[PDB]
Amino acid sequence: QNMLDNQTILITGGTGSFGKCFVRKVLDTTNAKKIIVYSRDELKQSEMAMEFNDPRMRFFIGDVRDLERLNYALEGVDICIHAAALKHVPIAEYNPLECIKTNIMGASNVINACLKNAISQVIALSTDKAANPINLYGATKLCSDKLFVSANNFKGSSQTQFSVVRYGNVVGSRGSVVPFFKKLVQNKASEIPITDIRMTRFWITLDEGVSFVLKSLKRMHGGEIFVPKIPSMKMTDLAKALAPNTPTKIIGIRPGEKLHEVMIPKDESHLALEFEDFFIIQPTISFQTPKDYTLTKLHEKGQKVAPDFEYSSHNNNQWLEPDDLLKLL
Amino acid sequence: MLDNQTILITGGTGSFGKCFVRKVLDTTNAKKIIVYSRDELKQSEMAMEFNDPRMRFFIGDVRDLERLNYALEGVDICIHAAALKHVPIAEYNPLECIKTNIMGASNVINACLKNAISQVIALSTDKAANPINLYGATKLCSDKLFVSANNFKGSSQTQFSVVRYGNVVGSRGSVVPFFKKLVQNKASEIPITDIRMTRFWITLDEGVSFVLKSLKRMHGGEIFVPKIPSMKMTDLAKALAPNTPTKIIGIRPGEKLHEVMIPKDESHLALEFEDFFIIQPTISFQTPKDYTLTKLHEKGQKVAPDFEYSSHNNNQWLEPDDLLKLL
Amino acid sequence: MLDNQTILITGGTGSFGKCFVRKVLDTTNAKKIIVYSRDELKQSEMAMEFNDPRMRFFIGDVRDLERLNYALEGVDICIHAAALKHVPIAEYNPLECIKTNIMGASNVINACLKNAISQVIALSTDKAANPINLYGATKLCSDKLFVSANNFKGSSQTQFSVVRYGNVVGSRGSVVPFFKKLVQNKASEIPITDIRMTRFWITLDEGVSFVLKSLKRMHGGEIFVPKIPSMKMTDLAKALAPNTPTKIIGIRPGEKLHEVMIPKDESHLALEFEDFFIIQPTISFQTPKDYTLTKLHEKGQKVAPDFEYSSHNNNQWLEPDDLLKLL
Amino acid sequence: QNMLDNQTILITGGTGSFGKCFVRKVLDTTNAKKIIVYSRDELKQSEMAMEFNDPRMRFFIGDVRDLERLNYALEGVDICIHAAALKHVPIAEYNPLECIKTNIMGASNVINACLKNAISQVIALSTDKAANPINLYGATKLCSDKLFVSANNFKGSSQTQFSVVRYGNVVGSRGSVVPFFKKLVQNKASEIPITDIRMTRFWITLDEGVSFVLKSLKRMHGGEIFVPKIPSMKMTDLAKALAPNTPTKIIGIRPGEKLHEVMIPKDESHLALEFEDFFIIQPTISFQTPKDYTLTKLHEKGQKVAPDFEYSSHNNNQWLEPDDLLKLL
Amino acid sequence: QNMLDNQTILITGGTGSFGKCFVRKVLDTTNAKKIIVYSRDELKQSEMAMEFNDPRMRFFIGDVRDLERLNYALEGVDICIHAAALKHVPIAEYNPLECIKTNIMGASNVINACLKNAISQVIALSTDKAANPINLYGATKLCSDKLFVSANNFKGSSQTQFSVVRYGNVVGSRGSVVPFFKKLVQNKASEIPITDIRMTRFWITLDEGVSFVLKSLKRMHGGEIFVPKIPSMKMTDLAKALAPNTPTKIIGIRPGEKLHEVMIPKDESHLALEFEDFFIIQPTISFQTPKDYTLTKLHEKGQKVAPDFEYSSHNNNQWLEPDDLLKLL
Amino acid sequence: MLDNQTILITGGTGSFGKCFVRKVLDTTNAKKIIVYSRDELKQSEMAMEFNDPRMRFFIGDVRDLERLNYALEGVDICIHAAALKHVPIAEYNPLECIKTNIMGASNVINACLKNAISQVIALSTDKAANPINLYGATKLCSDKLFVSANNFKGSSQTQFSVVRYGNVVGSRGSVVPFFKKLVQNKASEIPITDIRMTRFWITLDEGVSFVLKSLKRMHGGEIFVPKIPSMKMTDLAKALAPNTPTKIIGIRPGEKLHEVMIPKDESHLALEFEDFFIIQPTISFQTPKDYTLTKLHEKGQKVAPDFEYSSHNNNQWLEPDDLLKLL
């Protein structure tokens, strides 16, 4: 019950869509002692401090590529939510090392600084793009996920648990598809570009993600890659919600984009454990002090999966109509 | 043209390393061949087996940008083969693999641009296509860095390409050579992972010739893939042991049943050729290039929309008798 | 001459940033304009609003010397506008402001000399004259570094100048634009700091034109100051709200009642011109310069011994009606 | 009473005028367990160890720009006096980054290393040149002062107090004015250069400064910029003490020099608190665990000041005659 | 008695001749809780894990030139054996900075990381080449030895003892003389090269070295340079054991080679203490908390030496015949 | 040829430092002499005593590679005299001595190659031959780095040599000058270490002339050793105090009874000359050199097989009367 009770939480990339939503959720629904936003931009932090004018907030201007600054911010932290990252796929293809420095080396420093300040639980955000990735960005998240999972194979005088939360497209995220079909039809959208007529994706709301991360804290043992069960929607149906009466030119594809997204690769189905509405991808490596992932801290039991299971988007159980999208737009 | 050129190869004391050096001495007119690796043990031995004037050894680490700057001084061609490739060990030492493979790639690129090297080819791997293990992810980032490196421009231009191929028959501590120490071990029990297991197979000599060919074809920015045969991991044992038991020890941390070399989501970037494949960059360059015509004037063509070059669905297969011919 | 030149501007996605880019495209013949900033959000948007061939974006941090080296490759002109300027936030995150503003300045200078950039202009601020807050101190060190950078010499010379001016009307999150969100907020209560509060006021467009003019005037080593109007912070509210209460919320961490732009102890270094002021270096250079004649052959003159260009004692003042004309 | 009793003290720039005087004062008047001199030059340390041949002394060759070395020296220290710096104003104008590295980054590393080794009290030396500065040097001290004051806004498992001590010209300092009018008249001073006939400065003795720093330790809460009440003297009267019978040519001004020095800027008078003979400039930012600066640890009460107060040299209460200067030369 | 009982041991350069032998000795003869091999090559570690397939083993891929990685590996270690190094003398002459980075800076980081993780005992391996050295390699070991000895002059909240073990040529080491006269006669040795006909060296077996290091742990106080009493053999007699029936061409000398090796320099005989079969070269500097090196932890008493003693190889008590060499080949 | 050349000398404010500068101004036509050292105290004073246009001071640390890069810009000759030499202090602060002497040497070499300096001479010491103390070990590594630095090659070549000699009579805080402050101290008690104590003795002026001569002789890679006299440490007191007691205070941390300058195990590398010795490199270079003929065409010759240049067995000795003539 309420384990953020009197705990100090630090969230990197805290000024982003997830960050503001996560901070908002934690402030409203928990007795967290203090909530630390760790990010770089003074503009956004300056703005955020005004809209979240709360004494339980602390803003540290800092970069996840700077270990000394992180070591200083995590000082006395209990829980670290790692949401900082460079995720604009095509921009990442043109700026490889930047994305590597922020996502890979950033993961690296956060883990180092958390261990040093003896943090209790750490959850880093992943992405479906990190499974059998093709673009660099996805490659940097895969390296990220791997570091956090491996970070558990440590042995300090205070067990620090490291877990990962992976989920697909965030319906209407700060720069996604939905938040475009609105910004275009607002400035006389001559026509809203599309791509492949097979394009499918997983879907979830920002609130669902936050809630999920918040709950993963309650059942995590450390080492897990939690995957929530979410619905998928073909990119066509997403053409009748923010401009059905406006044509949509066909672009086909964009740099480093897939036709379908993978959440749980086939080659990892033996590590995958199933639950009522979420999966647990177990560590591919073994830890010194092994844990039993079949029983979460929330005493929710899990069963393995089909030796030939593949949790992909091109074909999942749940889907969504252009109404549900507006009903949850 | 390698004539009178200076060539540096990171990870020069490795399998590919030794073989590449041997091939360059014997067949090219390279003026100088520089080996850049960390271990003094392997370098002293290698200098003994290759007692040749055109050879030069530099004790160095790719994680050291300053040292690379120093050693790439006056080099025309750079072959990047340095890496931590043990997949399961990379799973336990992720940051080590990231520093060597990813940062390593970054430094090399930096030193190469600085010393104005003409062409660079970095060695990739099939494990970098739709990767699952850390090693593959690092190599994927590596390929990316090298491909992106082509957008840099100054008083001098540098061409960066990548060569990607699967398992190397009898590579430094691989499977095939292991299926020997077992025969010698008077042991009668072959350790398998999964009857479905499949991989692409290229020879040390073939990989090396493909790199040399690539140098002559590259515009810069390509990921060259040689068309090589696949082989059921069930026959690799059969062939190298027609009689002996196969104890299914399961899968190791990070293994795939089949390795992809040209992902399905990249078929549109692929260009087919007589013996090879060029996966085109996914980004545009200041100075565009036409990958349909190599520098050797070889014409390439697009592949079918649902194309994918994997080990499972390969039209070529190594025969247990034609495999024994490799060794 | 910006004709056919390559221009890089750190902090290119900022207010001055976007405006400077717009002015350079529309009016110059600059061959290439490079935006160098950290955020992918602002850069993707900016590339959309400026869909032009001569534009190029580099995701980078001024705290990264290696990345700057890379991006300044082949650049002729460099405009340094990157900085952490929120005064109170700089008061809580001093080292952050020091790293970005002071170290940032240092790296840029280094990369500029390395890539042999012809001219560099760094943006200063009135808060850097007889400063009190951390931000101002960092900018003061910045100006100093840039001014001192002119003593460096090699096969190529690089000119470093600084442009200093006060508040930018309606700048990214300033006061004036805030006195709008309040009107919209249906709020009837204007937050003031002190009836005496005074500041210099220049427009985004004016600041930009002054930088472009400076490039054409600079010998290297100058701190250009434009003659701009002052305005009682009491009228900025009056003008933008002839009717509404003013609740004196006091002073914020680090504020001054009046901002100096040319200190009294520097009057001897000052040179007066038609529209601007040049504060001469306090040190001597290997290659001296005559700051009394800009490159546009504009003749300057010394000011009175007890001279000081402050906001409190300014001979020019923005009229609440002529202020509404800015917006 | 005697709080250096059995404490280990580390003083950076310990081989300088202040350092030798401070070490001398501490050795003679306290039961400090050990006194660590942290500086770079082997020559001076070598010399100092001979003149201060005391077992309670420890000399660490080190640079304040090297965090690892500092982390190693502060190990087990209780009190840190930070006196290291580059202060030759004109030399600083020609060597900007050097002065920045030593004074700014140096401040930076000392604070970091003190926190890491859980030091109790830290006092960094400032200078009147840091108030409304014009020269770079002064700018580096202002950045310094700001870092030390901000360093208090931390929260480690052992409160470390950070304070600053600022005062003007040190009568006859290792390279000042007085110690020149002697070195010139000794080698047939044809004429001793002067400047502006309005030039005024604050004055204090090396011993007074040491004593002041030593007492600031006894009353500091952490976060203060202590300013002692000291006298001022026009640069003319300082022309009749070490060569009244020798002319003085007029140079006018030197690189980055002011006519008058500011100790407490007008724009900070609201932060300024007054006491019988010293001031306390309060933090412009607020700390999490606020302290009451109106009551020092020495139970000395302070009152605010005139809303339009300015503690400048061009006009202060106390002044000095060319006798007092020789009477205290 | 058995002080490795339940202790965690970390040995850098653990995949080398010494490393494998040392790990082998510790696994077989002690109740060490865990044994950590710290080295760079995946090939060797991969190989070693197979031949030493023991649960009490842990392999960390790491470089001694990387402090952050070391800080992470020594975490929770009790005893550190430092065997990592670049020792190919001529290769070191052509790659000076490399050898300096690995041996000097490597020593530097290990000491730093051991202190940080509060290691109990640390023994770094030296070499007779470090006494009055001529080659760079030897110069890097001398700098190394000096750092470890000096490392004792520290004062942390957990005394860490630092000692050095120095001995000569390891009979048949991974790349020495003996292991050559075999690899040559195996591939039709036309003739096996030799040098100066005065060439003498000290000798010892790999097992003797391990055992010695293992025992130095039991009697060390910290600060010692233990030197075992070992025999010497002229390079001629070493020509009748692995090819007496094959001629030996005369090369004379090689880059940076001496005619004779020094173990205890004459100028240090006043620091040297003698024992039944090993020497103790005492610190040239004095520590704050001085120890009595005349009485080892094994209660073995030692007496000083002749004020003009020199422990060189060109003339020592024990020697060896080409039989003993094969009898112990 | 120092004519119209730019000379930088690290540790320029030191004993050798000041003397070298004085000799270069007075006798050469060097266009510029740059002093690169850390302390502002000593530099401000030195600039006063050397108020000359060709002088220039750079506040910097040899541990700073970036700063060295900056200061060596446009330098032709580099004299490396910066170091921590106090033997006992180096014994307590080993890493400090290693950073300054060893890393310091490394950075200087790096910056020199980068800025394409023509010739570099680094100051060594007798304590670096068959060393025992940390200081000597660091200098030995230093010499090595500099000697090895000659194997680097690019569009420009740089020559690196080392000058090695013993004690400098009355050097900044040495023995002789101390045996003065004792006389002045009205003290009647001379502190000795050991009646056998012996050292080589060269004058500040001699060391400086030998460096200047070396520049004119060097091919690059040599360790020049001047033939200088030895002197019983018993006479240095006798001479400077014919009457006063000698209280044997023993030996200090790291002292030798006698200092070697050319080790016995190096006699084969030595080449004898009229006034000096060249110890040849122990490694071979890409571009070999003939050290038997300096650039001044001085012919050298091999020494006897068991040769060794030590202070104990020197054929030259300073006479207590000819020593007083030095001072």
Ligand SMILES: NC(=O)c1ccc[n+]([C@@H]2O[C@H](COP(=O)([O-])OP(=O)(O)OC[C@H]3O[C@@H](n4cnc5c(N)ncnc54)[C@H](OP(=O)(O)O)[C@@H]3O)[C@@H](O)[C@H]2O)c1
């Ligand atoms: N002294 C002798 O009797 C003797 C005998 C044989 C050989 N030598 C050789 O002569 C050389 C110089 O001797 P010296 O008597 O002129 O010594 P010195 O009087 O101690 O001068 C050495 C100078 O090096 C500078 N320095 C020290 N650390 C530095 C750093 N980290 N970065 C930049 N500069 C640094 C110091 O200047 P700052 O403190 O202002 O930085 C100092 O002025 C030595 O290297 C030694 O090898 C001396």
